[PDB]
């Protein structure tokens, strides 16, 4: 039953300047059936298939260099080394303002206790976290 299948959708906190902290947005509708947000990470409560996804927005006023490397990744940690599940790399520069989105999505086999994270490499360029478009979610199929 879909009611029993866990779900989690967290969104970046905009007031946490300089980093990418996840917050549940007081989601009392997302019937998390075990999934928890601990240490900025999602912990899987059950073994099975899960849809893991995440999106980040980057923003910059002008190009200082030409080697602006923005990356977004999703990792898994089981027995307390992290393993990358999904990753992406963008380079917007070759003061004109710019933006670059990075969405990640995939289906993976998880076991109970896994700890999923979604990390970036330039939290300074993170922006638009108040529109709900910077997110990180889990759906048990």
């Amino acid at each position: 039953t879909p009611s029993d299948k866990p779900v989690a959708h967290v969104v970046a906190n905009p007031q946490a300047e300089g980093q990418l902290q996840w917050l549940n947005r007081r989601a009392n509708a997302l019937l998390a059936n075990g999934v928890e947000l601990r240490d900025n990470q999602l912990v899987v409560p059950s073994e099975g298939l899960y849809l893991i996804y995440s999106q980040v927005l980057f923003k910059g006023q002008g190009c200082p260099s030409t080697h602006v490397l923005l990356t977004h990744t999703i990792s898994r940690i089981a027995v307390s080394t992290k393993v990358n599940l999904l990753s992406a790399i963008k380079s917007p520069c070759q003061a004109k303002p710019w933006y670059e989105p990075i969405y990640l999505g995939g289906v993976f086999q998880l076991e109970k206790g896994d700890r999923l994270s979604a990390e970036i490499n330039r939290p300074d360029y993170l922006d638009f976290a108040e529109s709900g478009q910077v997110y990180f979610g889990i759906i048990a199929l």
């Binding site: 879909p2 009611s3 299948k5 779900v7 959708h9 969104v11 947005r25 509708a29 997302l30 019937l31 849809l51 996804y53 999106q55 989105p101 969405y103 999505g105 529109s131 709900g132 478009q133 910077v134 997110y135 979610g137 759906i139």
Partner: peptide, 29 residues
């Protein structure tokens, strides 16, 4: 396309558990 859709979905405050699933796997349709 998918990206902006999941985001929008995540913000709808009058969406049930059942409904949020449906529209995520909707976006992913």
């Amino acid at each position: 396309x998918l990206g902006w859709c999941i985001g929008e979905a995540g913000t709808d405050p009058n969406l049930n558990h059942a409904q949020f699933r449906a529209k995520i796997l909707x976006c992913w349709x």
